[PDB]
Curated annotation (Swiss-Prot):
The lineage of its organism: Eukaryota, Viridiplantae, Streptophyta, Embryophyta, Tracheophyta. Its EC number is 2.7.1.47. This is D-ribulose kinase. It comes from the Eukaryota. It comes from Arabidopsis thaliana. It is found in: Plastid, Chloroplast. Exhibits ATP hydrolysis without substrate. Can phosphorylate D-ribulose with low efficiency.
Length: 424
């Protein structure tokens, strides 16, 4: 009977998924963000709010009437500043990939060496940059991440975030606190309270129950970031489970009982339930595949590969030099020689070599302290290549399969379900 709504506010549009408690999808949809008015000080946020209302309307009314819990994900370090009394968004949002290099020396002066906040795109750099513009009445402002802000439109209790969204402002999910080096600064007064992802905040506002026909007891739960929501969609929750994304770049995520952070390799941990999600990403993968072969060619050529035979070719497939993970070398050369005359042999070498890099990545995470990988689920454009699944199973020496779901909005709907179950 009861259903669970997840939404995903990504880089270009919004998506939703509604599930039952067994994870069966009852409704799903997508919308591109609409334009915003040039003069609108909310900027993109006005578009995001429009998309929230459009997505809600797109849910069939019979489905809305059963939705018991709502959660949503947004993009990492997309930062809004609001007045606490009026709710007015005080400036155009600082987007996930926007940088505030002006603030970075100040952040490096207060934060531990190589802390994740010490990057110009971090939420903290954005906060410090905004603070230092000396807006009148800045002491009455509050910071919200994109997901927090969209959820606050639904529940009307200002100022709450989650362990994942808050990592890039300096929140420590291991101690479940903001550290003293951050609390010692006056802009810390803008920081939101922080709860676990997928926990209840409060009931859905009456305006939404009245307008859209949600039940009066529908709750709204904290969310997460889009990258983590997409991982959650794989429904893997035990230490040693991993997801490889075979996308334009090769990104791996490993669930661990042990926290792992290493700036040499750009390795970072997020908290998930009572465990740690450990991630790293390589510049190999789909972008170099696409430079060499169309999608149609990859499918056709892969048909000719015998995935149980190893390629003798040692490649490091890259479009240009440089790697951070699993090799920390900004000058690391692409290696695609020798190139055999057979495109099938060439492709086999590339796919096998990317599997070696994937394996090397999981080995590194383990040597840095993570729970050793036991099973690898696969997402991204490369997941549909069953020959490559088999190549990877052989090279990794671990069971490999397709993740059953990979949409962030599906992962957000699992957080809605988590929060409902905890709330009952
Ligand atoms: N059969 C295939 N085998 C391996 N890779 C593939 C295959 N088909 C498409 N791709 C690769 O998938 C990449 C796109 O992956 P995707 O996860 O959809 O993209 P993005 O990272 O941009 O979100 C492309 O670079 C493409 O080369």
């Amino acid at each position: 009977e009861k259903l669970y709504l997840g939404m995903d506010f990504g880089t270009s549009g919004g998506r939703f998924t509604v599930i039952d408690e067994q994870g069966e999808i009852k409704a799903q949809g997508k919308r591109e963000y609409p334009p915003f008015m040039k003069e609108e000080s909310m900027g993109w946020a006005s578009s995001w709010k429009a998309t929230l209302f459009s997505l809600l309307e797109d849910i069939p009314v019979t489905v809305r009437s059963l939705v018991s819990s709502i959660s949503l994900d947004g993009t990492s370090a997309t930062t809004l500043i609001l007045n606490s009394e009026s709710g007015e968004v005080l400036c155009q949002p600082y987007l996930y990939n926007q940088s505030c290099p002006d603030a970075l020396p100040e952040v490096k002066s207060i934060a531990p060496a190589n802390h994740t906040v010490c990057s110009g795109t971090s939420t903290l750099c954005k906060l410090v940059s905004w603070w230092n513009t000396e807006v009148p009445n800045r002491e009455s402002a509050v910071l919200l991440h994109q997901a927090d802000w969209l959820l606050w439109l639904l529940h009307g209790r200002l100022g709450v975030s989650d362990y994942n969204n808050a990592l890039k402002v300096g929140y420590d999910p291991e101690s479940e606190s903001y550290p003293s080096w951050l609390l010692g600064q006056p802009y810390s007064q803008l920081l939101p309270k922080v709860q676990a992802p997928g926990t209840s905040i409060g009931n859905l506002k009456e305006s939404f129950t009245r307008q859209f026909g949600f039940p009066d007891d529908c709750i709204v739960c904290t969310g997460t970031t889009d990258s983590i929501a997409a991982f959650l969609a794989a429904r893997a929750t035990e230490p040693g489970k991993a997801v490889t994304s075979l996308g334009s770049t090769l990104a791996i995520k490993l669930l661990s009982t042990k926290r792992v952070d290493d700036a040499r390799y750009g390795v970072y941990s997020h908290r998930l339930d009572d465990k740690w999600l450990v991630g790293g990403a390589s510049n190999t993968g789909g972008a170099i595949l696409r430079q060499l072969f169309s999608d149609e060619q990859l499918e056709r050529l892969s048909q000719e590969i015998n995935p149980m035979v190893g390629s003798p070719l040692d490649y490091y497939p890259l479009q240009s030099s440089g790697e951070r993970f699993p090799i920390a070398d900004p000058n690391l050369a692409p290696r695609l020689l020798p190139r055999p005359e057979s495109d099938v042999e060439f492709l086999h070498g590339i796919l096998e070599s990317i599997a070696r890099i994937e394996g090397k990545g999981y080995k590194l995470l383990k040597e840095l302290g993570a729970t050793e990988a036991e099973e690898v689920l696969t997402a991204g454009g490369g997941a549909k290549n069953d020959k490559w699944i088999k190549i990877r199973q052989r090279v990794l020496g671990l069971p490999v399969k397709k993740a059953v779901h990979t949409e962030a909005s599906y992962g957000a709907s699992l957080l809605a379900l988590k929060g409902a179950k905890q709330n009952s």
